[PDB]
């Protein structure tokens, strides 16, 4: 007799989410003047918390900022609480339809993997919940090339990347190729530094250390070493910056140590 919606917030690439990043989470309830869906009458934020009790009529939910790393997904959909207690799906707000009933569940759009759906829950099948699904914004990984004065690999060196907030991982030089990469990888306006480590055993200290924020987006990045900035291809204090789309890559050269004599 009482009649309400809510949202559960899942995820796709499986992760659970903590509440630090659904501080980010913001989510809208609308309600139409017209079956049309074209104009809004109120509109009021809702938790995922909550249940908002709701009176006959239109209506439309759309996720206005995903919680903070997922990406965005500013689809409304649009359904309508009905006089008599039915509840129906009109579509997206790009894609207004003539109106379904929602029996059980009905599937909305695909989330990478996974669909959103809505499902009328509750004993006089009269809580309606949508549950909307959030595909993990891209990651971004760190590759070492090190090398000596001689352009011959070198290994031994170690390099130890201190994230803004979170703990430091360091790895040691591998003479291939292929280099190193840090199983830690860069996550989406994310703010990271790092320099060696410990010097290798023949070679020189490395004092610059490189700090690296990626973007919102996750798919692009700016690197400075010792503040200054650098590009792919170009090379201060002994490291070459090379990006591949997702992937940075350090090329460093060390120097042997000065031998005075007795």
């Known amino acids: 007799q009482q009649y309400g919606f809510q949202f559960q917030k899942k995820t796709t690439d499986g992760t659970d989410l903590s509440a630090d990043q659904l501080k980010a989470m913001q989510f809208n309830l609308t309600q139409y003047s017209d079956n049309s869906f074209q104009q809004a009458s109120k509109t009021n934020a809702i938790t995922s918390t909550d249940l908002q009790a709701l009176a006959p ?31 129906q799906y009109h579509g ?8 379904s009933v929602i029996n059980g569940q009905q599937t909305l759009n695909p989330v990478g993997d996974k669909s959103d759906d809505f499902t009328v829950t509750g004993d006089h099948q009269q809580i309606l919940t949508l549950t909307k699904y959030d595909e993990p914004k891209p990651s971004m990984t760190l590759r070492v090339i090190k090398q000596d004065n001689q352009s011959q ?9 201190q994230p803004s907030a979170g703990e430091a991982e360091t790895i040691t030089s591998s003479a291939t190729s292929e280099g190193q990469a840090f199983a830690t990888k860069l996550v989406a306006d994310g703010t990271y530094t790092m320099s060696e480590t410990k010097a290798p055993d023949g070679y020189q200290s490395n004092p610059a250390k490189i700090a690296i924020q990626v973007a919102t987006t ?42 005075l004599p007795l």
């Open 57 to 87: 009529g239109y209506y439309g939910i759309q996720e206005a900022a995903a919680p903070t790393g997922y990406q965005l997904d500013g689809t409304t959909y649009l359904f309508q609480l009905t006089s008599d207690g039915q509840w």
């Open 218 to 259: 996750g798919k692009e990045a700016t690197v400075t070493i010792d503040g200054e900035a650098l590009k792919p291809g170009e090379s201060k204090n002994g490291y070459t910056l090379a990006i591949d789309g997702s992937t940075i890559t350090l090329q460093a050269i060390n120097q042997p140590l000065a031998i």
């Open 153 to 161: 690999y070198l290994a031994g060196a170690a390099f130890t990347l």
């Open 92 to 99: 997206t707000k790009d894609n207004v339809t003539s109106g």
